[PDB]
Amino acid sequence: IAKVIYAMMGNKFVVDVDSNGKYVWFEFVLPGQPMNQGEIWKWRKEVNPDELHIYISENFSRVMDRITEHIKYHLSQPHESNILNYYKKLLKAFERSKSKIFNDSFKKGVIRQAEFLFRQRSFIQTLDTNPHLLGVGNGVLSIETIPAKLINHFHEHPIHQYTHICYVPFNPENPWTKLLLNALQDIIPELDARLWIMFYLSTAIFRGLKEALMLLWLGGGCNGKTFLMRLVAMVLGDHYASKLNISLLTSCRETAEKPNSAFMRLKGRGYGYFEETNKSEVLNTSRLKEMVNPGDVTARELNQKQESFQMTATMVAASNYNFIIDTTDHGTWRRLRHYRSKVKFCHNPDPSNPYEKKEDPRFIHEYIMDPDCQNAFFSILVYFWEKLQKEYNGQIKKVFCPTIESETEAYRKSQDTLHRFITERVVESPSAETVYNLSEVVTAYAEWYNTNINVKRHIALELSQELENSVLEKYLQWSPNKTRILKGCRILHKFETLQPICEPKNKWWEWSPNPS
Amino acid sequence: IAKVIYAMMGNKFVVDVDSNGKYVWFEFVLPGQPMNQGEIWKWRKEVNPDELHIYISENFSRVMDRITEHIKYHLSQPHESNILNYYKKLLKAFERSKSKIFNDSFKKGVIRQAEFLFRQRSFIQTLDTNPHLLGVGNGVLSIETIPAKLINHFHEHPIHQYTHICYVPFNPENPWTKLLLNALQDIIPELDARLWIMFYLSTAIFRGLKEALMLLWLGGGCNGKTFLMRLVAMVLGDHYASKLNISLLTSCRETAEKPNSAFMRLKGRGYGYFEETNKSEVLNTSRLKEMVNPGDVTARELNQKQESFQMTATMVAASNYNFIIDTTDHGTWRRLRHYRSKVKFCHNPDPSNPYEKKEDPRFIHEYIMDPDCQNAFFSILVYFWEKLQKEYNGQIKKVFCPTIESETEAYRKSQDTLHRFITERVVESPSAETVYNLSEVVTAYAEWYNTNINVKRHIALELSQELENSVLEKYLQWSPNKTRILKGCRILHKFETLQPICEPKNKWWEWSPNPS
DNA sequence: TTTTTTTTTTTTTTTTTTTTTTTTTTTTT
DNA sequence: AAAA
Numbered sequence A, B: 001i002a003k004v005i006y007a008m009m010g011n012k013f014v015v016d017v018d019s020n021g022k023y024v025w026f027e028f029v030l031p032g033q034p035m036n037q038g039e040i041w042k043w044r045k046e047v048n049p050d051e052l053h054i055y056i057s058e059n060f061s062r063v064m065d066r067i068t069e070h071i072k073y074h075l076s077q078p079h080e081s082n083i084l085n086y087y088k089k090l091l092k093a094f095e096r097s098k099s100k101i102f103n104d105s106f107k108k109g110v111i112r113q114a115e116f117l118f119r120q121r122s123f124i125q126t127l128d129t130n131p132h133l134l135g136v137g138n139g140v141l142s143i144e145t146i147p148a149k150l151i152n153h154f155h156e157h158p159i160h161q162y163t164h165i166c167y168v169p170f171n172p173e174n175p176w177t178k179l180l181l182n183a184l185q186d187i188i189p190e191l192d193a194r195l196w197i198m199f200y201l202s203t204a205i206f207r208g209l210k211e212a213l214m215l216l217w218l219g220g221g222c223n224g225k226t227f228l229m230r231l232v233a234m235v236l237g238d239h240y241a242s243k244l245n246i247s248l249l250t251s252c253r254e255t256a257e258k259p260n261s262a263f264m265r266l267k268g269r270g271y272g273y274f275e276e277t278n279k280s281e282v283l284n285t286s287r288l289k290e291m292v293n294p295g296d297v298t299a300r301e302l303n304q305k306q307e308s309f310q311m312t313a314t315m316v317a318a319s320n321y322n323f324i325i326d327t328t329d330h331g332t333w334r335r336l337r338h339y340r341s342k343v344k345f346c347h348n349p350d351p352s353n354p355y356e357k358k359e360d361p362r363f364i365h366e367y368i369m370d371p372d373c374q375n376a377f378f379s380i381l382v383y384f385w386e387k388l389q390k391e392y393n394g395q396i397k398k399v400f401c402p403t404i405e406s407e408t409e410a411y412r413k414s415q416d417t418l419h420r421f422i423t424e425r426v427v428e429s430p431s432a433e434t435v436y437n438l439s440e441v442v443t444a445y446a447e448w449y450n451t452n453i454n455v456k457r458h459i460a461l462e463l464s465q466e467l468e469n470s471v472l473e474k475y476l477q478w479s480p481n482k483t484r485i486l487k488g489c490r491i492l493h494k495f496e497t498l499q500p501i502c503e504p505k506n507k508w509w510e511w512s513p514n515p516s
Numbered sequence C: 001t002t003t004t005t006t007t008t009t010t011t012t013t014t015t016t017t018t019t020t021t022t023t024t025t026t027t028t029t
Numbered sequence D: 001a002a003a004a
C-alpha cells in the first residue's frame, strides 16, 4: 500500500530526519480543514500522522471496492473452467486480505514502511533559509520584488514559522493608520530623525545579513520609549523577535565552565531589544563587537556543545539612565548610534511648552492587543521598508540625517574620563616645577576616576599609551634612563585653579527627494 | 536473503560499531542519486538503512521472477509423474513465501541478520587518519604528491569529513584571484613577511604532526586583521577549522570537577585563531607549552571520559592591545613568533602616506559568502603550500625572513620587567651604600611593578634567582652568615635624577629567486 | 565583597515491548 | 466435514 499511498498524497506529507534521529512528519495545510488560527498555506510539524491513518482506512477502501467490482465483472462474463477456478481462488484470497487495512498493527507497519518513500533529503536545513519570505496569518508575504507580493494559494516554498498578524496593503485612510501616524509624529518632532528611526526599524523584517549598526536612545522618563519598541516585538511575534537581558552586556567575561544560555538567542530572530534597566551600568567592551558584527557567533547554552551560527537581528537599547563607554578605538564608536528624546509626557500639560504633552496611558495598557492596530502597524512598516529599498537600495548608512551623527559625536565627546581629567587637573606650568615621572599621572587619574565616576580596577601599563595619545603628547619628554616623563604641568587636588529644520505640509511619510 | 543482498552491493554499504556499541551504517555516495550539496564521491554516515530497504523490494524482486519462470519451464518439459509432483510442491511452497519480502518485520529481521555480514572490522577508528586527503565539494583532493590530484571518480580511501568548497586549478587570470592578490599585497607591503605569512597559513590544510609554532601579530586597529583570519576559517569550514576563546588563554587553571569542553577541541581541526577580544589581557605562561607542542593532550568533557588525542593545528593570534608574557627560559620564547602591522585603514585617506589606505568595508560585510572568491582563495592556498613543499621540504623553520625573528627578538627585549626596573631605579653605588640585606630590591620592585604595570602576587624564591641571572650578578656579594648580600648598589627611590628589502616587478607570488 | 557556583551536572530515563505466540482455511483426513 |  505504501506505493499507492505515495500516489495518494505525494504533495501533502514530507518525512525528514531530525538531529536526534527520530523521523518527523510535516504536512501542508489547506483551507477548509481542522486547523489552528492563521497557519493557512504553511507547513506544520507533526509526530504521528492522523490524516494519513484516516485516509488509509476511509478513502483507500474505495479502490479495494473498485478492484472487487472489477473481479465481479470479469467473473460474470463467460469463460473456461480453469480461468473461473483461478478467479475464484484470487477472489477468496483478496477477500481474506481485504479486512487487514483496518487493523492497528498493520496500519502502523504500513506507516513505518511508507516513511521511507516520503523522505526528502535536505528539508530541515533548508527551512526558512530564504530571508525574503514571511509567514503571516493569511498566507505568505514575499519581499523579493517591489511591491511585496502576498501568496495565498499552492506553492513550493518551505516555510514553517510564522506570525499571526494578517497583512493588508498600506491604506493611509484607515483610522488606525492615521492615529498611529499622528502619535508617531508627536513622539519625535524632528522629521529627519523620524524618517531615520522608521527606516532603521523597517530592516527588522529582513533576516539575512545586515550592516553592523547599534541603536541606543536615552530619555529622562515617561517618554515614547517602551511603547513602539514593545509594539514592534508584539507585531513580529515571538518567532521573529525576542527580548534580551541587559546582563548580556554588563556581565564580565565568564569562564568556559559557565554555560551562557542567552547567547543562543537571536537564532533566526531578526529583532532583539533590551528593556529599560533600573540603574546606570558599565559596559565591559566585550559582547559589543561580536553582537554588532555580522560574522559568525558561537556559544554553548546548557548541557550542549559549542555551536556556530549567523546572527542577523536589529538591536535597540533604551534606558532612563545613562550608559558607560570607555574606549576610543575606531573599530567601535563607529558602528554605534545614540539618540536623546526631547519630549516629555505628564498628566497636566504645561502651556506654551511644545516639548511636553499629556500622556495617554491607554496607549500602553491597551492598543497592543487590538489586532487592527497591529495590522496597520505592519502595513506601515512594510511600506517604509519598500521605501528604503526603492530609494537607498537597502543601504541604511546612505540615508542622511543631520541631527544624527551630530548628537552621536557629541555623546562621543562625553564618556571620555581621561580628557576630562586632563582638563580638570593639569595646567600649563611655565616654570618652577618638576617632571613628575609617569606613575603620578596614572595614579591621579585612577583616584579621580574612583572619586568622580565610579570605583573600578585599572592597569597602570595600559593607561600610558593613551597618555601619549592624549593632548599631553607635546609635553611628553624622554629621559636619560629611557623613560617617559611629563613637563609643563601642575598636578592639582582641589579647585585652586588660580595660579598665574523643516516640517511637512500634511504628510511626512510621503517624504521629499532630498532628505526632509 | 542476507547473503544474496551482501552479494548485491558489497561495495556500497559498510557496518561498524561505535563506542556506545550501537551499529552504524556508512554509504558511498555516487553521482545521480539524492544527496545534499557537495558530498559526492565521499562516504556518509547513516543510522537506519533506507536505500537498502528500497533495494530489498525493488531490484531484488526481479531475481525471484527469474526463479519463478524457470520452474514453469521445468514444469513445461514433459517428465515422470513424481518429478512433476515434486516441482508442483516446490512452486506452491515458493509462491506463498514470495510475498514475504514485503513484510516490514521480515525486512527488519533480514537487515538485522545482514548487519553481521556487512561488518568491516577496524573502519571507524581508521577514518581520516591519512592527513593527505581532503573532502571537497567536487570530490576529494590528495596532496600526497606534486601536483595535487583531484579525484572525482571511484576510489577506496575511507574519508567522511569534508568541506563544501569546489576546487579549481590555480589560475592568476581569474578576476577574484587578481583582486585577492592585490588586496593581500596591500595588507602587508613587506615581500618577505608576506611570503612568510602565506607559507605559515598554507600549513593549515595539513592535519598531521606540525612544527611547534605560535604566531601572534598586533596592530593599532582597523587593519588587515580579522579579515583573512576569518576568511581562512570560513574557507576551511567548521569540519577542519574552529574558533576558540581567549578565556582559554587567560584562565589561570580550572580545578577538578571541570566540565572542560573548549580544552578538548581541535579533533583533526588544523587551524585555530583568536579574534581581537578583551583589552590588553595577560598570559600566565600556562596553556602554551601543551598548546604549542606536537604532543598528545588528554581531557574529559561533559558526561565523558578523559581521552587523549594528538593536537595538530596551526595557531594564530591577533589583538589591538598588548600582551603580557613573563618568562625567560629558552624552551619558551623559541616556539613563538611576533609581528606588528604597519598600515592603517580609514574613510579619509592621507595623501603621500604609503602606510594609510582607504578601507573597503565590502571586504568584510560581503566577499565571504560569495563562493567565487572562496574557490580562488583555496586555489591560492594550495598553490602556496605546494610551493613551500617544493622549496623548503615542508619545514617552516628553514624559510628565510629577515624582518621576522628580528622584530620578534625586539619584542622579547620588551616584556622583561626586571631589566627595565634595574635600569630605572637601581644604579651603581657611589658611596655610603650598605649590603641592603637580601631581596629588598625585589621587595621594592614588587610595588614598582604594581604601580607601573599591574597588580599581582610574587614569590621571593624564584625572583631571587633571576637577580643572579640579571646583570646585577657582578654586584652581588656573599656574607659571613652565608647569605647573598647585594653590594655596589645605590638602590635609588626617586625620579629626579641619579645620585652620583625589495619587491619584484608585478608578481610577488612568483616568489622571486631563492633569496627572494 | 568578591568569591566557586552550587547546582548543574547528573540522573533519569528510555522503553519495553511487542515481538510474537496462537491461528490458519484449506488441506487432510 | 472434522482434524492437522
Ligand SMILES: Nc1ncnc2c1ncn2[C@@H]1O[C@H](COP(=O)(O)OP(=O)(O)O)[C@@H](O)[C@H]1O
Pocket (backbone or CB within 6 Å): A182, A183, A184, A186, A187, A219, A220, A221, A222, A223, A224, A225, A226, A227, A276, A320, A345, A357, A358, A359, A360, A361, A362, A363, A364, A365
Ligand atoms: N504620542 C503619544 N501621545 C500621548 N501619550 C503618549 C504618546 N506616546 C506615549 N504616551 C503615553 O506616555 C506614557 C510614557 O511612559 P513610558 O512609555 O513608560 O515612558 P518611558 O518608556 O520613557 O519610561 C505611556 O504610558 C503612554 O501611554
Ligand SMILES: Nc1ncnc2c1ncn2[C@@H]1O[C@H](COP(=O)(O)OP(=O)(O)O)[C@@H](O)[C@H]1O
Pocket (backbone or CB within 6 Å): A331, B183, B184, B186, B187, B219, B220, B221, B222, B223, B224, B225, B226, B227, B276, B345, B357, B358, B359, B360, B361, B362, B363, B364, B365
Ligand atoms: N587591503 C585592503 N584594502 C582596502 N580595504 C581593506 C583592506 N583590508 C581591510 N580593509 C577594510 O578595512 C576594514 C578593517 O577593519 P578590521 O578588519 O576589523 O580591522 P581590525 O581587525 O584591525 O579591527 C575592514 O572592514 C575592511 O573592509
